[PDB]
């Protein structure tokens, strides 16, 4: 149901307190929610879209120089002047040549020369910016009870298509059959705009830092500039060849497109062509499940003779998906689905697609469940037509908690302080961890920022070393939070 197959599954369960839970969801990740009632849903952020951009600065990439003129002057009588030096299209430089009687002036000294050539661009890079309002997220909500060929397809209409703006509110989502879910999304604090500058080259696009964008050495121009002739730091794309003490010349430095593609190693590529669509980042959701119904009560229990048509097919960490075909009853009915051990005694293992249901009998309905570790026996239907199907979930252990620990530490690595969500009013634990993580990550960033892949590992080894050989049991201070943590972030960056 759009979530099986994606390798970032992120089951969240526990709707304690009222009937809300906090979730946060990226573009590359989908989220499956479970409760004791109130059937399971799947949440995926499909597109971020900023509506109305405003260009702030236009860097140039390739240019050319025409009208190359020069003028010199005899030594000690000052420096020359040229009529087109008055324009700020013509890039200029004064330099010393030596002059004598062969040059035709006199005094045998070192004169001064000037050179003008008009600087006309031919490839513009414009960097647009957007405000945190009028940008529109889009999230899809698809439910379970998997009628056929709705498993992981991005295409097809199978989920509700609500859209999030910071102009918006409670965001009612009346998805049919079930109840009506509401989402208190917070899109202002999601991606931290007013630093995002959405620069657009020839046909590609990127999402860069603002202060990185403004101090970029290239001949720039203001964003509100019509008739783009008055380029400002034109000397960063020209050079003045004064090889010996003779006449000097100008040459265009060349296309900066490839060097700019080397400048962008670390910026997530976005799509600015027929709409400024983004496909990175996240947003924080408050997921209220006051009004949801199971769709399954007031249907009779089934009568038997099911049939499997797609095999048991474990995909992606123990959440098996089996597709069954039904033949013969009053066709709207439930499914006698359960997971037993060998001697059919203990209901061990959890059903994820809760309360499955057969509708319009000649159509498959596929079922998702979570077996225990080891042998389990998936049982469909009643006794004249049971399907007792073995499954051996590939034997894991304690190690499922260590891979949950790795997805938690990685989730704290990509998301800094927002990663203390997936939790519903932790109170005395969640809020203090979020506050301490704000005051630690706020002095981690902007006091360890700007460095690369390597330098985080290097400073991690330095702090680990000078902590490990310290005294007075400050070694725990200089190791457990700044040594191996920075060494851990040294191998997770450049994502």
């Amino acid at each position, epitope marked *: 149901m759009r979530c099986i197959g994606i390798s970032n599954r992120d089951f969240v369960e526990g709707v304690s307190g009222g009937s809300w839970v906090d979730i946060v969801l990226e573009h590359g990740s989908c989220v499956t929610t479970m409760a004791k009632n109130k059937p399971t849903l799947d949440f995926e952020l499909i597109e971020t879209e900023a*509506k*109305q951009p*405003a*260009t702030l600065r236009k860097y140039c990439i390739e240019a050319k120089l025409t009208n190359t003129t020069t003028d010199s002057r005899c030594p000690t009588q000052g420096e020359p002047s040229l009529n087109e030096e008055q324009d700020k299209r013509f890039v200029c430089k004064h330099s010393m040549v030596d002059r004598g009687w062969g040059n035709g002036c006199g005094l045998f000294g070192k004169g001064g020369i000037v050179t003008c050539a008009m600087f006309t661009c031919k490839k513009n890079m414009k960097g647009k910016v957007v405000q945190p309002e009028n940008l529109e997220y889009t999230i899809v909500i698809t439910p379970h009870s998997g009628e056929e060929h709705a498993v992981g397809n991005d295409t097809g209409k199978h989920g509700k298509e609500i859209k999030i703006t910071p102009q918006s509110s409670i965001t009612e989502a009346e998805l049919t059959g079930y109840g009506t879910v509401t989402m208190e999304c917070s899109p202002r604090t999601g991606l931290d705009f007013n630093e995002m500058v959405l620069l657009q080259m020839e046909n590609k696009a990127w999402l860069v830092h603002r202060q990185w964008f403004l101090d970029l050495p290239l001949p720039w121009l203001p*964003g*509100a500039d*019509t008739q783009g002739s008055n380029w400002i730091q034109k000397e960063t794309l020209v050079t003045f060849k004064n090889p010996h003490a003779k006449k000097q010349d100008v040459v265009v430095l060349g296309s900066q497109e490839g060097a700019m593609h080397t400048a962008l190693t670390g910026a997530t590529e976005i799509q600015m062509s027929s709409g400024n669509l983004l496909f990175t980042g996240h947003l924080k959701c408050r997921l209220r499940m006051d009004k949801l119904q199971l769709k399954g009560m007031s249907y009779s229990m089934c009568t038997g003779k099911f049939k499997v048509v797609k095999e048991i097919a474990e995909t992606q960490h123990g959440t098996i998906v089996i597709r069954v075909q039904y033949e013969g009853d009053g066709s709207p009915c439930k499914i006698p689905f359960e997971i037993m051990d060998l001697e059919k005694r203990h209901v061990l293992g959890r059903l994820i697609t809760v309360n499955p249901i057969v509708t319009e009998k000649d159509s498959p309905v596929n079922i998702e469940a979570e077996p225990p570790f080891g042998d389990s026996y998936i049982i469909i239907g009643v006794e004249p037509g049971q399907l007792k199907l073995n499954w051996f979930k590939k034997g894991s252990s304690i190690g499922q908690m260590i891979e949950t620990t790795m997805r938690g530490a990685k989730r704290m690595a990509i998301l800094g302080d927002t990663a203390w969500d997936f939790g519903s009013l932790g109170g005395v634990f969640t809020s203090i961890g979020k506050a301490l993580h704000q005051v630690f990550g706020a002095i981690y960033g902007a006091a360890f920022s700007g460095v690369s892949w390597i330098m985080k590992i290097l400073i991690g080894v330095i702090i680990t070393w000078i902590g490990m050989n310290s005294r007075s049991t400050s070694l725990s201070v200089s190791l457990v939070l700044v040594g191996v943590v920075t060494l851990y972030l040294g191998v997770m960056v450049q994502a």
Partner: antibody, heavy 127, light 109 residues
Framework: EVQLVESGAEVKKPGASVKVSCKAS????????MHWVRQAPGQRLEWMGW????????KYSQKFQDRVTITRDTSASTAYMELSSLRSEDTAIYYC?????????????????????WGQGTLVTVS | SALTQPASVSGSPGQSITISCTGT?????????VSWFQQHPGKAPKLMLY???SRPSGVSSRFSGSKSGNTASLTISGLQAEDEADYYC??????????FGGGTKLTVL
């Protein structure tokens, strides 16, 4: 209570200069700007506009920057319009346009509204 | 340096009409200084809108406007016979000058 009357002209000749005037009533003259708007017959409303004030520091137009100047006087509360070097396309219906000046005496930014009240229009012609 | 509202629009009485106007990033794309006017053919053009959604006293609540970047749209909901007149837009540039629109002729019958 705010009424803006104007003074019309019958017909002109190209090569002459026209001087249309306008009396402002219902409000004082010292803290109010008074612009000028063209309306050629069946055309776009062009902008003669003059940012007058109680001091008289006034910006020209852009199309008509070095072609027209104006005068004013406070005791008559009249902003004038001395359109010199008349041509064949200079026939239009000229309006005086009330505008409000900042309370610091200067006129740096205009208000949220521009033109609450208008003149009736003077249909000048050339011949 | 001119506004490009269209030539003429029309709509039956009871419907809603929309009048758009596109401009540069120096007068409408960055600033909120957009206003509208009612030029009756035998009258001076009367101020029908202040700032992009605002409205003068005396003007009925039938008139409403919006702005979506470089485009400022005027919406008249529930037209009547007293709207058969021209509509001129306006914008204050960042330079310091004013530009007006071409003019839309509105008919209902």
């Amino acid at each position: 209570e705010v009424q803006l009357v104007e003074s019309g002209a019958e017909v002109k000749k190209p090569g002459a200069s026209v001087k249309v005037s306008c009396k402002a009533s219902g409000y004082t003259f010292t803290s109010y700007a008074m612009h000028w708007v063209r309306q050629a017959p069946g055309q776009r409303l062009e902008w003669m506009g003059w940012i007058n004030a109680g001091n008289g520091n006034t910006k020209y137009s852009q199309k008509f920057q070095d072609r027209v100047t104006i005068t004013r006087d406070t005791s008559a509360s009249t902003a004038y319009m001395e359109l010199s070097s008349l041509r064949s396309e200079d026939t239009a219906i000229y309006y005086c346009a009330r505008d409000k000046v900042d309370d610091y005496g200067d006129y740096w930014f205009p208000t949220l509204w521009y033109f609450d009240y208008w003149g009736q229009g003077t249909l000048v012609t050339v011949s | 340096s001119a506004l490009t509202q269209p030539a003429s629009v029309s709509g039956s009485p009871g419907q809603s009409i929309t009048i758009s106007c596109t401009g540069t990033s120096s007068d409408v794309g960055g600033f909120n200084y957009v206003s509208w006017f009612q030029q009756h053919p035998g009258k001076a053009p009367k101020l029908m809108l202040y700032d992009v959604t605002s409205r003068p006293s005396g003007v009925s609540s039938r008139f409403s406007g919006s702005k979506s970047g470089n485009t400022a749209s005027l919406t008249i909901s529930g037209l009547q016979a007293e709207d058969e007149a021209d509509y001129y837009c306006s914008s204050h540039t960042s330079r310091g000058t004013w530009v007006f629109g071409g003019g839309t002729k509105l008919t209902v019958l």
